[PDB]
Structure 1
Amino acid sequence: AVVKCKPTSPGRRHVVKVVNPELHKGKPFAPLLEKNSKSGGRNNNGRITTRHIGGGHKQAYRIVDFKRNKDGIPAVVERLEYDPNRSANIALVLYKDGERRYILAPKGLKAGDQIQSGVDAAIKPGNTLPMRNIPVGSTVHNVEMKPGKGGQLARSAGTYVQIVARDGAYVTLRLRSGEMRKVEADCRATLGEVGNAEHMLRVLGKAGAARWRGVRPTVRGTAMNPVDHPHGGGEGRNFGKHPVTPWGVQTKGKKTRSNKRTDKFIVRRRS
């Protein structure tokens, strides 16, 4: 649950941690791990292309099955696990034929539950179906955008999308952002919300807790010299200019989406 720390030191006073007693405590399942060394925000030129990234704890990548294309074979949840690479929890499932896989853990899932995918699967949380077989109004997560590609929407802790309408070859979805989007009705989705919905109640409490996650300090633009940022300079605290990014683009309101391929699929913007 959500647990407040007692203020036995100034770095502990404001810490709020979310602790799940039902997560596995041992090592992860070895056959489904790979390495992923860190970038530092640097691209193959060696230049920083995203700022404020670096350090943090070493992590190993869990191969999560986002496709759920093992149809008609029921699986049993073995245990829930912590995943360092994402905010949601992942479940280890065991298929009747002896294969093990990681999936995103939906809300309410627990060890011993039955899941399966395919067009004939039951309408229960954790089951994967093509969206043309799911009733209108259902709450789904891990939604595909192109059939067979793998789920791409609503993968963070506590998120979900809602199937608001179905008309022909397309279904209209309401995304967490509030955008109404049109998707092919043959794409797959998993029923229910993504678990670990209390992830957002966490409070880090100190600077080091953010450094443990590989976030480096952000220097404000007004704190620099004019040669460094459009906001720099001044005797004392001076601003006197319209806010911009480090590269001179207005940063409070100016819209940046420019993609005419996919404009046909957007029914309403998030507003």
Structure 2
Amino acid sequence: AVKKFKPYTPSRRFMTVADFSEITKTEPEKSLVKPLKKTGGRNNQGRITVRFRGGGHKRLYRIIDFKRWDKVGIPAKVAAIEYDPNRSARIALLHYVDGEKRYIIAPDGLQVGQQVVAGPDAPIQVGNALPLRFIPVGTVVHAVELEPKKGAKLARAAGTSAQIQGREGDYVILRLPSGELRKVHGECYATVGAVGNADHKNIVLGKAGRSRWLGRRPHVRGAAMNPVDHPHGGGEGRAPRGRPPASPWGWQTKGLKTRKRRKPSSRFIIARRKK
């Protein structure tokens, strides 16, 4: 769930925090962490290329296993479930019988102590990884490779899942988190189950400070600026858009589709997204 606070400051009034109930281990594998080089949204030129970023809490990156076909047939025990500050999902520590230790993102209901495994012959059960071609049509599924051996790309965020809808040739038909209908190749691995921590989205930041802790610096409206700065800039007193609503760089921002028409993957997308 998500936990409330009593209104003993103006901000604690609406603030909510995750319950961290599923967490069993509160410091990470030293051998599995490296430092996360904070960018501040600046690129190698030194220029801001993603506005309003910086000054969030320090973080160590936990190395995650997004392959799984790395260790076919070798089973693992789920040692712990831990906090990961780099993603919405929680992560599970896996102790392979190999001795080797790895992190995966923790599917919903995955239990510390249980066993998981990967490969064509794996039982259809939460935490297991199989090529999509071997996973029974209708099962919810996450951490999906988009192309074989290229890494898990789809449905990694908290609470998200893709569902296998059917098969066709060497491809299987998925319903993505977004609601898009897409053909993904059958050799692509995927873990069965949805991602855990589904109550993530119900968190109420509650105050400006919380945004600042996440490296989220204040976003300043176009309408609040001057013509030198923004299409919506200027005007005596408040002003409506006075033109079709636009980005800082001039392009329209209510409806204007932006995916390339002649993109090769178009041949593999059956139906554009949901709502």
Band the TM-score falls in, shorter-chain normalisation? over 0.9
Distance (Å, rounded) in 2 between the aligned partners of 1:167 and 1:242:
43
Alignment match, 1:230: 231
| Shift in Å, 1:26 | 3.3
Structure 1 residue 254 corresponds to structure 2 residue 275: no
Alignment match, 2:167: 166
Structure 1 residue 270 corresponds to structure 2 residue 273: yes
Matching residue's letter, 1:202? I
Distance (Å, rounded) in 2 between the aligned partners of 1:188 and 1:251:
36
Cα distance change of structure 1 residues 176 and 22 upon mapping to structure 2, 3 Å threshold: closer
Alignment match, 1:109: 110
Q: Which runs of 5+ in 2 are unaligned?
A: none
Contact 2:26 2:83 in 1 (8 A): no
Q: Secondary structure at the match of 1:221?
A: coil
Cα distance change of structure 1 residues 131 and 205 upon mapping to structure 2, 3 Å threshold: same
Distance (Å, rounded) in 2 between the aligned partners of 1:111 and 1:228:
53
Q: Secondary structure at the match of 2:149?
A: coil
Distance (Å, rounded) in 2 between the aligned partners of 1:14 and 1:237:
30
| Shift in Å, 1:241 | 1.8
Contact 1:56 1:211 in 2 (8 A): yes
Alignment match, 1:23: 23
Q: Secondary structure at the match of 1:132?
A: helix
Alignment match, 1:46: 46
Alignment match, 1:8: 8
Alignment match, 1:71: 72
CA RMSD of aligned residues (A): 1.0
Runs of 4 or more above 6 Å deviation: none
Contact 1:41 1:53 in 2 (8 A): yes
Alignment match, 1:83: 84
Contact 2:124 2:135 in 1 (8 A): yes
| Shift in Å, 1:22 | 3.3
Contact 1:139 1:162 in 2 (8 A): yes
Distance (Å, rounded) in 2 between the aligned partners of 1:115 and 1:45:
44
Contact 1:170 1:183 in 2 (8 A): yes
The Cα offsets for residues 187-231 of structure 1, whole Å up to 9 and x where unpaired, read as: 111000001111011001000001000001011111111111111
Alignment match, 1:197: 198
Contact 2:26 2:82 in 1 (8 A): no
Q: Secondary structure at the match of 2:50?
A: coil
Contact 2:25 2:80 in 1 (8 A): no
Distance (Å, rounded) in 1 between the aligned partners of 2:24 and 2:161:
25
Contact 1:129 1:190 in 2 (8 A): yes
Q: Secondary structure at the match of 2:174?
A: strand
Q: Secondary structure at the match of 1:162?
A: strand
| Shift in Å, 1:25 | 4.4
Contact 1:24 1:82 in 2 (8 A): no
Contact 1:132 1:186 in 2 (8 A): yes
Matching residue's letter, 2:174? L
Q: Identity of paired residues, percent?
A: 59
Alignment match, 1:32: 32
Contact 1:34 1:60 in 2 (8 A): yes
Distance (Å, rounded) in 2 between the aligned partners of 1:52 and 1:174:
33
Alignment match, 1:221: 222
Matching residue's letter, 1:90? I
Matching residue's letter, 1:83? D
State which drifts further: 11-20 or 203-212: 11-20
- TM-score relative to the length of structure 2: 0.96
Distance (Å, rounded) in 2 between the aligned partners of 1:22 and 1:220:
39
Alignment match, 1:94: 95
Distance (Å, rounded) in 2 between the aligned partners of 1:105 and 1:141:
10
Q: Secondary structure at the match of 1:222?
A: coil
Matching residue's letter, 2:269? I
The Cα offsets for residues 48-69 of structure 1, whole Å up to 9 and x where unpaired, read as: 1000111010000000001012
Distance (Å, rounded) in 1 between the aligned partners of 2:93 and 2:79:
5
| Shift in Å, 1:2 | 1.6
Matching residue's letter, 1:36? L
- TM-score relative to the length of structure 1: 0.98
